[PDB]
Each structure stands twice: as structure tokens, then as C-alpha cells.
Amino acid sequence: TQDSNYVRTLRQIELKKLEKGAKQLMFKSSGNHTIFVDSREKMNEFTPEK
Amino acid sequence: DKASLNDDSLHDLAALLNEDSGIAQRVIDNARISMGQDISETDMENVCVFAQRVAS
Amino acid sequence: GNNGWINILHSTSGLWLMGCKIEGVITDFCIDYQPISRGKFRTILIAVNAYGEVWEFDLNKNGHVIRRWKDQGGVGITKIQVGGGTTTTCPALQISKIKQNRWLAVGSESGFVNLYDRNNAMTSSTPTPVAALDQLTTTISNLQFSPDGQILCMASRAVKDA
Amino acid sequence: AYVLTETSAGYALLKASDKIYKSSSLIQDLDSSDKVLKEFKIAAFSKFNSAANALEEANSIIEGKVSSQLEKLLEEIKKDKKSTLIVSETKLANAINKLGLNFNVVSDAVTLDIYRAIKEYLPELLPGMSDNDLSKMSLGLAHSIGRHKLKF
Amino acid sequence: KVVIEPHRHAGVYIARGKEDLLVTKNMAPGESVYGEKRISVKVEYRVWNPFRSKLAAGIMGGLDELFIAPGKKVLYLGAASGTSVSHVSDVVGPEGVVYAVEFSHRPGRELISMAKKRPNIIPIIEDARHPQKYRMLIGMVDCVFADVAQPDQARIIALNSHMFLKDQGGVVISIKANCIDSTVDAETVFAREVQKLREERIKPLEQLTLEPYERDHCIVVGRYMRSG
Amino acid sequence: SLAKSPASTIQILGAEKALFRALKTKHDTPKYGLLYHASLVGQATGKNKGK
Amino acid sequence: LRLFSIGGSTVVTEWDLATGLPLRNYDCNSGVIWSISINDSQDKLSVGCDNGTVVLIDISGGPGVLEHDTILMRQEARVLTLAWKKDDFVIGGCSDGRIRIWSAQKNDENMGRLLHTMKVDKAKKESTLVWSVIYLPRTDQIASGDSTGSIKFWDFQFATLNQSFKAHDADVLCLTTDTDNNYVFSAGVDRKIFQFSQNTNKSQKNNRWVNSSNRLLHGNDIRAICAYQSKGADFLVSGGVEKTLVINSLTSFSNGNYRKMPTVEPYSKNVLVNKEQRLVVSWSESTVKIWTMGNYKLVCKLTLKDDQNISTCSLSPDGQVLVVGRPSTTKVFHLQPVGNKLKVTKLDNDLLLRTSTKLVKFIDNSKIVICSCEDDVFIVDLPQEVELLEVTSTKSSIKVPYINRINHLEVDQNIAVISRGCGVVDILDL
Amino acid sequence: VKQHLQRETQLKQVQQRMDAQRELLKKGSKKKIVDSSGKISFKWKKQRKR
Amino acid sequence: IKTKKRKTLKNLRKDSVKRGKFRVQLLSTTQDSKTLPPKKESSIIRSKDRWLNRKALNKG
Amino acid sequence: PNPKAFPLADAALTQQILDVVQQAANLRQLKKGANEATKTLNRGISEFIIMAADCEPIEILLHLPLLCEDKNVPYVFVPSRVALGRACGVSRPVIAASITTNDASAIKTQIYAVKDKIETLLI
């Protein structure tokens, strides 16, 4: 029982450090990025730069 | 508290710290616009007994 | 039967008289009577689903639900029996001595046995147990009443001396 | 015609010459502006008493029914024995229809272009009916009603 | 040691330090809401987490025309715990204000405590579904944010569109597919939703999925155009 | 927050230093912690005080 | 009165009765809609949808108002059919092989929760499902037809079955009742209708059910039943996928001589003929096939690539001009021969391209009459109008809208004639 | 952060194996099965404790 | 030949061009959306009619 | 019968939840008691949460949904504490239970089925 206690304590330690890491971190997003417009000619003429 | 405040209270505050600093006007208008808890009678009497002890 | 089907066959003919059905999974069922008059009496069929939805039907008219109720607690119900009067093990020999059963026993999956009084259970209609036996540690499979209504024998099927 | 506004500095009734066709002109004009505000600007504003207890009972009985100060507006809401007002609320229209004055108020019809129009407009009444920054009075009123609504 | 970089939108800064970060100029310094940290450069700067804030998932998701600015008025339907809405109060700063609304009472008490501290938030603690009870206290909002899990987002947002929206205004809705329908595909449910808003006069412009933060949430950015 | 936490934690709350040292060194956990100053534990004695 | 329809989409369409438009698309909030039924007093309609859920949309205060009111407590089985008892109970049958009893009651804390679940003995080498539920008022029972081919009478108090029948072999598809609850009619997919009775005093006194009679009358299979029982007449109408309608009597289901209402009723013409170059021309859904004859050979085909409505009203005068019109836009062509081929060219004008046309005829090759959907007659010359003498709206015109619209018009060389179904025939010189 | 996550997974694995072994010592009627993939595990008799 | 012009009917008919990471589809016409009830569900109606005319009953 | 405890099960879900409880007790994969439930919830290895719906007073279980939402784990009400007690296999009236993680089970499939059922209910 004391062994299970000790291992549990270190596991919670590592869990909390991982959560503080994920809170202090920053990732990058990549999702479906759609854009609406009203003309099909203007749609085919769309350019992200323009 | 920030409620029981009147013109003679402002005058005796001028006989106290000052009114000419404008702090009297500032505290009465912030007393009108203040959003902290209007403290009740017992918090009131306790901060009263606290202040009296400190002044003594 | 299959799911909630209890079927009923006229015996010394071999005929199909009538079938009634509840839902869920029928675990068990037993018989009680009610006298009315000089030699006239109605039989009531009692059925327990697994969850503890006791149904009580009658059989003089065709299958018309008298009532339902739900046993208190009762996760896994696995035997019911009535007792204190006439039954399937202590039957009468002539029509006059048919007497209403008084005590009703529900033996669960734990080893718990809920035990009811009918005379007020029927009234309060989601009633409380007269008592809750909690002795055994395994399943029940045999519950039998006395001839006269005092003694309740309960019996497991999974360990010695149970 | 009359136009109701429940301002966060008070309660006001205004006049308007005829309704629905005026709403057509309003939505096609965008009469939300100071022009139409001046065009039908003022009949009677009544600033509420600066007492948050009276204010809490006020807007509670406003969400519930008609108010006592609302009856103090109703003492001269009228010029004809049925004189139609514009309210923005169904139950309040029905309450002022089924209580002691019994006369006509247009129900929750298309007149929300109208009410949002005077909602864009009442900022240009900031020295007109109640002469201050009314949003501070809004903040005080909202905290009072929240601290009353939740127990706290 | 840490440098700043301003964003496309105002108030939004990317902090390039020991790690890149999303941060906003604080209103008041040295005071926490949900146990977040800080950074100064003196100017005090508060992080958001793109996990725990959905608009934070939007900004680093990348949205062209968000209709927030400093000196404006925003509506927030769905400010539970007050985190993202206090942060939106931060980004509109002193001059602008937000009207937050909420119905469940535990985040109700949390948001009203943040309202005790911070001034620019004004709280309404009602069910959103009957806007008369807050058209008594709100007038002519500029932009709208809507994160409400109820399925009739179109009805409730069209209601606040007819009541409070500024003309040619800006609106942002969030969509949880696994809350509205929970069986079928993301872009399908999204197209159905923006069809609803298109019939309800809201001209949309873009939508974006929040993949490595949320499970099939997206956000729809659109305008209110020539409508009342 | 004190409500959110469970019962055995409430039996602990005080002696957290002794706790974490005892768990990192695999010894006996402490029993009373902070609840020693209750009148009931003042009535009891010993292993009864633990219970 | 209004008419709501559910298509295979995810919306309800409350149609526009005076005109024949979709008056309102109400999108349901929850996925693909499977079935619909409205409560007693026509107050609250309810839809059952594949996400497993029952949506209550209440209708009050005139037409067009469709507001979400309630969701019921949902479960993983797709809902196949629904039926209201009163303002209190929604009974639904679903492809977990079982029937749920949901509560919709005002001022009781059990609003929203399903409070009973009854089950069907399933098939063997299939995955059976409940097809239709109907509520019987007098003896407080519910009936369900389910895909094993069975008819099951549950009773609604205590949620328990009283009667079961293996009537007809494949899966049941529709049920209905008479009003005062003596006969219940069931109809399968194997072209059979069975009548179940209670009407004698003994079967009333025990509330038993006994299947009186059966009959097969259809060609392919049966899809829908409806009953009506009033002092003028007592009949049910059954509609069969063998694409035709049949009519039977309620007091005399074993006796009454049936009527077979035919496949096509010619109230919608699809074809036209003209002696200029010996033409027959047929418009179908979005397709115009022509023939010339004298033997014959086909000519053209107009798969109108733009729009997707059924071509309602079509025309060709003497010569080679073509009008075809929808209640949405129009489409006008100039045609030309070369022999075994023809040539078509589309004209262009915004008035015709926007406006809506119920009916249209030719005066010459040049001036034609446009019957708008809103009861307005244009003349166009290849934007000149004419007033119309109003008819009185009566109380029946208030209830039923579409009786006042222009039903027919005929124009010869000069004088046109206009007819609305109230009983007005009217003469125009144009 | 990746290292920490992997460490956490290892720790929870060892904790779960130790926890099952610790529960293997109390009471009941135990029954040893070999899952035919090659796993060793147990199953208790249907027996409610007092 | 004509097969590829059938596919160019698909090309002139389609409404979605991807631009690498990004994607643009446009707004359907007001008169269509207002004066048609929307299209049916292919998968669901196919499922129901398949369940009707399965092989498990020997129809035809 | 207890209107504070909101998301409440029906008959069929009640039956299947208590059955999967029975298999859980036969496999030693679940923890009993409200305090140990909150413990394994803070340690976050719980598959899901069952609460009883007639514990008087109701707050003893009502302290759970806050953390259940904060870690996004599904929780579901069953309306008899004695029933849940006999289902889990302890003579006393149990009011709370949690099913724990073990992806080496033979009850994996039923756990996941009832999990998504409780989820779609809880939406």
C-alpha cells in the first residue's frame, strides 16, 4: 500500500508539471478555412494575396 | 460607510483633512458610483472598533 | 416464454387458453387467489421482471392488468413467491378452504430478500418492505413458505450449506 | 400618437404623428439618427428617483406589470379617450389594456425598427432629458438588479 | 529579454520570449481571475489560453475581420466563469464596454465577482431567450459574440440581431457539431447553420475550424447588412 | 474549493509537510493533521483519537 | 388553416395556400426529419428525427410563426413515427424495435422525460422496427403496426399489451381508426387491408379485439391510409404505390363497392398539338420533347439547365415560338426548322425572367396574356396591364384561401374569358 | 513536454499493475484465466461481500 | 472526348475551387432558397427503400 | 422525485447502467463511495460517474458535477441508492460510484456503448 502511495505521488507530480507545461506552451492551428463571396467570377478571381 | 454622507459631513471633513483639496467631492462622488458591498452594521461596528483601537 | 410472454395452457385438454406479456425479461412468477363469495374466487398471476417491476394480472376475465408497482431497491430479481395461504406447494383440496395469501417474498441477486405485507402493499401501491433480509452472499434460487404461514425457507445454489 | 421609452435614466413618453407607413419610411431612411430624434424628440421624460431600492422595485414591477411611476406617466398619457402608444412588449401592452385605463396601445408589431431607431437616437438626448453619462447609471442599476436577483 | 509584436487587431500582442505567446495589455495589474500568469515589459500583459478560451482559439486560428476595437461596445452571450469576457474587456480597454449575459448561477456568481473588480463589464444574469428583460438596460451594441450551446442559435441570434445590432455590424458565432447533432459531418452542419443565418439576414463572410484546440468546433464570422 | 475536496483530505489538511516527506520516504502517513484542536478529539484518547 | 409538409430534407415547409409557394422553411434544429404529427387543437406540431429526438414546435398566432419550443429527452434510436394523445403524451415508435411514451404536459415536473418504454418480440434473421403508432381514444389504448407483420394493441395506462395479431405477412405500413373507435384499419406492404372490430356489446364489455375482415385491392403495394366518418358519408381513402387511389366505405368494408381513382387525372396537361408543321409537343419535368408527324419523328429536348421546377404551363402558337412558365421564373424561346433537326434560341427580358406565370395563351404570335400567381393579368407584346373586378371574400374565403384565384382563361382572336372557382366567369376585351 | 507525457504513461502503467496486485490480497473467491492472446488475469466469483 | 465534356459540364456546374490551404464557395440565390423546399436526403431515403425492397422478402 | 438533481435516467438506461455496474463489481474495476469517487476524479482515471438520486441531503452527491464538468467526464443519475448498493455488492446504501480505467477488460465494449449513450443524453 505504501508503494502504491509513492508511485501515485510521483505520477501526480508529473501530471501537474505536464499541465503547467501545456498551459505555458503555444501550438499552431490548422483547420478548415473557408471564405464566402457573391460572384463566381470574383470567386474564381479570388487570390489570398489580393 | 459610503452612504450616510451629507453636506455637514463634507463640512466636518473640511474641519478634518480638507475639502479644499477636492478630496471631499471625490469621495462623495465615488461614494455615489461605488460598487463594493454596502457593509452591514456588524462589519460596520467591527471596522469601527478596529479604527478606534488604532487611534487610541 | 421469450421476453415478457407467459403463456397459459388448459391442462386436461392440452388447449391454449390465454397469454399475457410484460416487457424487459421475465425472471419469475407465481400464483395467488382471492375468494369473493360462496365458492367463487379469482386467481391472480404475479410476475417479476429483472428490474423489479412487479405486475399483478388477473385471470377470470381475460388478461387485464390489475396493477404494477416497483420493488424498493431490487437490482437483480431472481425469485418471487407468495405464501401464508394456498399456493403451488400447499394447495387446497376443496374449494371452500381457498384462503388469501398474506406474505409476499422477493429474493434478489445479492442475497437480499425483500418481504412485504399484501394487505397494505396493495394499498400504498409503491410500498415499503415489512422487512429486508440481508443474510446470504450469493444468489437465491429457492423460496418456500410454510403450510400455515410462519416459516420462510430461503436457499442458495452456489456454495455449501447455504 | 405616443412612443414609450424605458431609458436607463428614467421613463419617457414622446409624441409621433402618423405608425406603420412611418415605419416603412423609417426603415428605408434609417431614421435612427439625430435628425428624426429632433423631428419627434420630447413630450415628457421622468427621471427615476436616485434610490436603487425604488429602482429595483421599479424594474421588477416593469418586468412584471405596469409601475406606479408608470401610472404617474399615465395620468397624462392621454389626449383622446383611446390614445395609441407604442410599447416594445406584449405583456405590458396587454396589462395597460386590461387595467384601469383600458385604452389602445399598438401591440408588438413591426415597430422595433422604431424602438431601435430611438435607441440610436437617445444618445443625442444626452443633454436633453437626463444630462449626464447615463451608462454609469446603467452600470449601477445593473449591479443592483443582479445583486437582488441572485441572492448574495 | 521578451519582445512584443502587435497583431492585425488592436490590443492583441504576440510575445516572443522564451516561448511565443498570446497576450493582451492589462487593464489593472497584479490581479488574477483563473490562476493565469503574467509578463511585463513598465507594461503589464496577460496571457490567454487557446484551450480555455474559444476566441483565443479564433485569434491564433486566424480570422481576418474581427469586429472588436478599443472604443466600442460588444455583446457576449455565454460568459460562463467570465474568463474570455474579462479578456475581451481587456482588449476593448478603458473606453469600450462589454455587456455579458449568463443564466446558470455558479458562473453567475463568478462573473459578478469579476464585475465587482473590473468596471467595463456589465453583467446580465438572465435566460437569453427573452431580450425584453435586458432591453431595459442595454442600448445599441456594436459587435456580437455568441457562444451558447443551445441548438436554436439562429433564433436567439436573429432575435438579438433585430433588437440590438448596429447596422452593417459584426457578428461571430461558435458552433459545436457534436452538441447540435452529434452524428454527422462538420462542414455539413456548418453549411446548414449559415443557411439559417443567411435566411435570417446575416450575411456571413468566413468560418474556421479550431482543430488542434477543440473537438470539431468552428466559428462563423459575418455581418449585419441593411437590416432591422 | 474546500467543499470540492473530499473527506480523507479533510482529515489530513494540516500536516502536509510531514505527509509529503513521509510519502516520498515511504513511511507511515500522519493521522490527525489539523483536526487535533477539536473538542471531540479532546474528549477521545489514542487509537480512539485516530478513529 | 395551414398545410405543413416534411420532405426528406431537414426542414419543415409550411406551404402558402393562396399561392402555392413555400411560405416558410422552418429548419429543425436536429438533423434529418423522419416523421411529423400535430397535437389536438392543432396547437403544437411535433417532429421525430434521426438523431433520436423529438422536437416540439408550437404554432400560435397566425401562419408563418415557427419557433422552437422544446426538445424531448433523447436516445440513440432513430424515431420512425409519432402520435399525440392530448396536450400530455407523445407516443413514438422507433427502430430499436420498441415504442416509447414521452410526456409533454404543462405544469408538472415530468415535462420532457420519456416515462414508459414498451418492447416488441423481434424477428429472427432481420432487425425489425415499429412502423406506425395510432392512439385509440374510447378504450384508452394504442395500436402499433410493426415490421414483423403484426398488429399489437397495447393499453396506455400501465403500458402493457392486451392483444396481438399476426395478420398480414410482410411489414405493416399504415394504420388508422374511425372516430368513435369501433373499427381500426391496418394496411401492409403485401397489398392487404385488414379491418379489426370491437363493435358488438360483448367485445365492448371485455374491450377485446377481433379481426373481422381482409381484402386485397392494389397492384404493387400499399403506402397510406386515411379515414373519415361524417353524416354526409363514411369512407376511407387508401393510396397505393401502384400509383393510384382507392376508395372504400367504413360501415361496410366487407360490402362497399370500391372505386379506383385512376393513374393520371388530366387536370394537368402535359402535351399540346398544332397544325403548323404538324407538331405534337410534350413537356415533362424539366424536359420538352417534340414530334412532327404525318409516321412521326422526334425533334427537340429542352433539359433546361438553369432551374429545377416541373414545367407547369407550356405553349407554342402558330409558327415556332415557345412559352414555358413556372411560378418562379419563365423561359421563352424562338424556334427554327432546318428539317430533321430544329434549333432553339432563348430570348432575354428581366420582366419575364423574374415574373411568375400560372397560365398563358396566345392572341397572335405577338401579344400574349400572363396570369400571374398573385391574380394579375399582364399583356405582353413580344408591360401593359388590365384591371380585374374584385370578388367578395366571404368567411369561406377567409378559412380556405385559394378559392378566389384565377383558375382558367380562354382567349380566341379577340375576347378573353377568366374564371375563378368561387363561381365567377368574366369577360375581358384586351 | 513530450518526455513528460511519455514518463506519465509509464508511471500509470506500473501503478495499475501494482494496484491490481494489491487488490489480489483481500478476500473473495478468485479465478485465474489466460486470455488466449497470452494475458494472465483474474475474475472473481459472483459473491457479494458482507 | 464527349466524356471529358461531360466532366466539363461538371466543371462549369461546380462551385468549389481550392486555393492550396484555402477554399471558396459562394452564396446560393435568394429566389432558389426561398421558392424551393430543399433537396432530399439520398442516404436516408435509399436506406428506407432498401429496407422495403430487400431480398429477404421475395418481391418479384 | 428530486428536482435539484437534473440529468436523470429512464427505465432502459437504468437497467443497462446497473447491469454494467454488476459486471464492474465482478471484475474489480470500480470505486465506491462519494469521497473515493472524488479522489479518483481528481486523479482523473475515472471512465465515468454514477450518482444516486434520492440521497437526503442532496448536496453530498451534488458536490460532484462541478469537477465532472471541469474534466469533461459524463455523469448520470439513478433513482434508488439501495438499488445501486445491491448492484455494486455492498449491504449499505451506496449513493455514488465511479467506473475506472482498464483497457484490458472484457467489458470495454459495453462501457463504451453506455458511455456514448450517457453522453448524448447529457448534451
UniProtKB/Swiss-Prot annotation, chain B:
It comes from Saccharomyces cerevisiae (strain ATCC 204508 / S288c). Belongs to the NOP5/NOP56 family. The chain holds residues 225 to 280 of 504 of the full protein. Required for 60S ribosomal subunit synthesis. Coiled coil: none annotated. Present with 13500 molecules/cell in log phase SD medium. It is found in: Nucleus, Nucleolus. Interacts with NOP1 and NOP58. Component of the ribosomal small subunit (SSU) processome composed of at least 40 protein subunits and snoRNA U3. It comes from the Eukaryota. This is Nucleolar protein 56.
Curated annotation (Swiss-Prot), chain D:
It is found in: Nucleus, Nucleolus. Signal peptide: none annotated. Present with 34700 molecules/cell in log phase SD medium. Belongs to the NOP5/NOP56 family. Interacts with SIK1/NOP56 and NOP1. Interacts with the trimethylguanosine synthase TGS1. Component of the ribosomal small subunit (SSU) processome composed of at least 40 protein subunits and snoRNA U3. Required for pre-18S rRNA processing. May bind microtubules. This is Nucleolar protein 58. It comes from Saccharomyces cerevisiae (strain ATCC 204508 / S288c) (Baker's yeast). The gene is NOP58. The chain holds residues 2 to 154 of 511 of the full protein.
UniProtKB/Swiss-Prot annotation, chain E:
Changing V3D: In nop1.3; thermosensitive allele showing a decrease in histone-glutamine N-methyltransferase activity upon shift to restrictive temperature. It catalyses: L-glutaminyl-[histone H2A] + S-adenosyl-L-methionine = N(5)-methyl-L-glutaminyl-[histone H2A] + S-adenosyl-L-homocysteine + H(+); a ribonucleotide in rRNA + S-adenosyl-L-methionine = a 2'-O-methylribonucleotide in rRNA + S-adenosyl-L-homocysteine + H(+). Changing A79V: In nop1.3; thermosensitive allele showing a decrease in histone-glutamine N-methyltransferase activity upon shift to restrictive temperature. One of its GO terms (molecular function) is histone H2AQ104 methyltransferase activity. It comes from the Eukaryota. One of its GO terms (biological process) is snoRNA guided rRNA 2'-O-methylation. Keywords: Isopeptide bond, Methylation, Methyltransferase, Nucleus, Ribonucleoprotein, Ribosome biogenesis, RNA-binding, rRNA processing, S-adenosyl-L-methionine, Transferase, Ubl conjugation. There is a cross-link at K54 (Glycyl lysine isopeptide (Lys-Gly) (interchain with G-Cter in ubiquitin)). Belongs to the methyltransferase superfamily. Fibrillarin family. This is rRNA 2'-O-methyltransferase fibrillarin. It comes from Saccharomyces cerevisiae (strain ATCC 204508 / S288c).
UniProtKB/Swiss-Prot annotation, chain I:
Belongs to the UTP16 family. It comes from Saccharomyces cerevisiae (strain ATCC 204508 / S288c). Functions as part of the small subunit (SSU) processome, first precursor of the small eukaryotic ribosomal subunit that coordinates the first two steps of ribosome biogenesis in transcription of the primary transcript pre-RNA and pre-18S processing. During the assembly of the SSU processome in the nucleolus, many ribosome biogenesis factors, an RNA chaperone and ribosomal proteins associate with the nascent pre-rRNA and work in concert to generate RNA folding, modifications, rearrangements and cleavage as well as targeted degradation of pre-ribosomal RNA by the RNA exosome. Part of the small subunit (SSU) processome composed of at least 40 protein subunits and the RNA chaperone small nucleolar RNA (snoRNA) U3. Interacts with snoRNA U3. Interacts with MPP10. This is U3 small nucleolar RNA-associated protein 16. The chain holds residues 155 to 214 of 214 of the full protein. Residues 28-60 are annotated as: Disordered. Residues 38-52 have a biased composition (Basic and acidic residues). Present with 2120 molecules/cell in log phase SD medium. Disulfide bonds: none annotated. It is found in: Nucleus, Nucleolus.
